Enzyme design. Structure first.
Site, PDB file in Angstrom:
ATOM      1  N   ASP A 376      64.813  -9.453  56.249  1.00 25.35           N
ATOM      2  CA  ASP A 376      66.185  -8.928  56.164  1.00 25.35           C
ATOM      3  C   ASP A 376      66.824  -8.746  57.541  1.00 25.35           C
ATOM      4  OD1 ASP A 376      66.056  -8.813  53.384  1.00 25.35           O
ATOM      5  OD2 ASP A 376      65.782  -6.622  53.306  1.00 25.35           O
ATOM      6  N   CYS A 410      73.775 -19.963  55.313  1.00 20.63           N
ATOM      7  CA  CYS A 410      73.152 -18.649  55.162  1.00 20.63           C
ATOM      8  C   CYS A 410      74.306 -17.764  54.612  1.00 20.63           C
ATOM      9  CB  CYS A 410      72.480 -18.112  56.439  1.00 20.63           C
ATOM     10  SG  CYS A 410      73.503 -18.124  57.934  1.00 20.63           S
ATOM     11  N   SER A 411      74.688 -16.670  55.245  1.00 16.92           N
ATOM     12  CA  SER A 411      75.749 -15.747  54.837  1.00 16.92           C
ATOM     13  C   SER A 411      77.061 -16.133  55.595  1.00 16.92           C
ATOM     14  CB  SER A 411      75.327 -14.321  55.176  1.00 16.92           C
ATOM     15  OG  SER A 411      75.019 -14.209  56.559  1.00 16.92           O
ATOM     16  N   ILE A 414      76.217 -18.996  60.693  1.00 16.56           N
ATOM     17  CA  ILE A 414      76.125 -19.190  62.154  1.00 16.56           C
ATOM     18  C   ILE A 414      74.779 -18.764  62.775  1.00 16.56           C
ATOM     19  CG2 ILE A 414      78.659 -19.135  62.475  1.00 16.56           C
ATOM     20  CD1 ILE A 414      78.560 -16.217  63.331  1.00 16.56           C
ATOM     21  N   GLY A 415      74.168 -17.701  62.272  1.00 13.33           N
ATOM     22  CA  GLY A 415      72.939 -17.166  62.854  1.00 13.33           C
ATOM     23  C   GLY A 415      71.689 -17.890  62.432  1.00 13.33           C
ATOM     24  N   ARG A 416      71.234 -17.615  61.187  1.00 20.30           N
ATOM     25  CA  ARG A 416      70.071 -18.329  60.630  1.00 20.30           C
ATOM     26  C   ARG A 416      70.411 -19.806  60.492  1.00 20.30           C
ATOM     27  NH1 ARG A 416      68.265 -14.544  55.521  1.00 20.30           N
ATOM     28  NH2 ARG A 416      68.577 -12.530  56.565  1.00 20.30           N
TER      29      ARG A 416
END
Ligand SMILES: CC1(N)CCN(c2cnc(Sc3cccc(Cl)c3Cl)c(N)n2)CC1
EC number: 3.1.3.48
Length: 476
Positions: A376, A410-411, A414-416
């Protein structure tokens, strides 16, 4: 991006804003390591606002969510939105995050690096209180220019005196020093020290792990994000506002996926990433599910990589945009059948059949790889699971003739998403060229960040990328 100070404490930030700033002055700094703080002067007092980043976006307390700190600052500098005005950046004189700065580096080490890795106009600056600017010129030689620190200012022995090494370097980049026999000491590009041969990844990771080297390299890459403030006007349009998961996390106009056969609706928060190509996008909203399938169909994408559970921490990260196993659903003009689901340790594979309603001959299989075990917060403690998943995704894509870009989401996308894509790009160079290939992690990330904002969000993901490449090479 001089408003970012990498090494200051909250007390130092307060003193700097009270003595060297005015009402409206601000700076940003690292915090709880991993977080950031925006320190702002307002009516003679200093407020410190928390900026959190667990890997998906920069979340400013009492503000919005952003893809980068440069995008955050640009937004508040151009918009009564912060509850606090950001009028005057308080500039940092610390050179530690400059690409050309090498702190404790000897003259022999510097000549060796400029000789082996340099070209015409390659330069670096290294450090009792004075500095040395070393430049390579030719088609060749190395020239060392002494930089004196006299009463807090910097100079090359005559002329102007600068308040920082950055001001000195920018000045002599614009107005080059000329040797009296004609040679122009052109400061064309900083010496590249990040590009390594893949077989020496273990050695570079060991050196970056000492007191940490990973932090310095990551923050030096972050310092270059102000060169990536490309326009995102299409995502800002009134008709497109509710198609964005986060109002200020938008696709660049120049790489956004344009949707063509629309209801006589060309927008989706998604960008093409070219290094095999990818589409980096956000998790679907209920009102963007049909646009998502229009994108997959139009781009001829046959593989989707989902890097989040549908719900994490009790919050929706991506609506379920696919049918239940064995079911058939219509999503606007697109029809999807979930043919079969297969469970594996870290992921579930969903074999989907996508076609356009009224046109049976347009059917194609889309393989959805749903990674389910990403923590998470932070990154996985071992990259093996991510690597085995990416290896399977790669072989699936490679087995399909003329498959379009692999969709990764992902959400916020950009990150994961950036993390998976960057590891994929790096391991693709190694699978093909073998262990005798050059890889440059920050160069690859900067290239991906020029096609979508904030691709790779945290130092924890930056380190995970190095760890994943090291692990991949060790099992070769
Ligand atoms: C020793 C140092 N202080 C820290 C490590 N180092 C350093 C320098 N430049 C970068 S960015 C970068 C690198 C390659 C291509 C592109 Cl395109 C970009 Cl943007 C970086 N992340 N680290 C050199 C100086």
């Amino acid at each position: 991006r001089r408003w970012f100070h990498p090494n200051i404490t909250g007390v130092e930030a307060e003193n700097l804003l009270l003595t060297r700033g005015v009402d409206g002055s601000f700076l940003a700094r690292p915090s709880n390591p991993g977080d950031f703080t925006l320190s702002v002067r307002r009516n003679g007092a200093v407020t410190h606002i928390k900026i959190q980043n667990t890997g998906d976006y920069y979340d400013l307390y009492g503000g919005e969510k952003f893809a980068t700190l440069a995008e955050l600052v640009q937004y508040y500098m151009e918009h009564g939105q912060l509850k606090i005005e950001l009028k005057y950046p308080l500039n940092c004189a610390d050179p530690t995050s400059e690409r050309w700065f090498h702190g404790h580096l000897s003259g022999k080490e510097a000549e060796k690096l400029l000789t082996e890795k340099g070209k015409h106009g390659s330069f670096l600056v290294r450090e009792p209180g004075d500095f040395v600017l070393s430049v390579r010129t030719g088609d060749s030689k190395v020239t060392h220019v002494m930089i004196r620190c006299q009463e807090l200012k910097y100079d090359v022995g005559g002329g102007e005196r600068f308040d920082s090494l950055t001001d000195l370097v920018e000045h002599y980049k614009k107005n080059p020093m000329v040797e009296t026999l004609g040679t122009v000491l052109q400061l064309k590009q900083p010496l590249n020290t990040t590009r390594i041969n893949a077989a020496e990844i273990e050695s570079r990771v060991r050196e970056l792990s000492k007191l940490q080297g990973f932090w310095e390299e990551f923050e030096t890459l972050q310092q270059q994000e102000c060169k990536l403030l490309y326009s995102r006007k299409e995502g800002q349009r009134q008709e497109n506002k509710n198609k964005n998961r986060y109002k200020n996390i938008l696709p660049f106009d120049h790489t956004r996926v344009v949707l063509h056969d629309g209801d006589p609706s060309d927008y989706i928060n998604a960008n093409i990433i070219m290094p095999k190509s990818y589409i980096a996008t956000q998790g679907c909203l209920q009102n963007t599910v049909n646009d998502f399938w229009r994108m997959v169909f139009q781009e001829n994408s046959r593989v989707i990589v989902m890097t989040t559970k549908e719900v994490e921490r009790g919050k929706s990260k991506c609506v379920k945009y696919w049918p239940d196993e064995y079911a058939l659903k219509e999503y606007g003009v697109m029809r999807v059948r979930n043919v079969k689901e297969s469970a594996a340790h870290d992921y579930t594979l969903r074999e989907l059949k996508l076609s356009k309603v009224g046109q049976g001959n347009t059917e194609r299989t889309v393989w959805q790889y749903h990674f389910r075990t990403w923590p998470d917060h932070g990154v996985p403690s071992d990259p093996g699971g991510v690597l085995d998943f990416l290896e399977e995704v790669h072989h699936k894509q490679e087995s399909i003739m003329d498959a379009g870009p692999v969709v990764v989401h992902c959400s916020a996308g950009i990150g994961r998403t950036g993390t998976f894509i960057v590891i994929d790009i790096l391991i693709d160079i190694i699978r093909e060229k073998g262990v005798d290939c050059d890889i440059d992690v920050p160069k690859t990330i900067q290239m991906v960040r020029s096609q979508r904002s904030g691709m790779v969000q945290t130092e924890a993901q930056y380190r995970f990328i190095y760890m994943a490449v090291q692990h991949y090479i060790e099992t070769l």
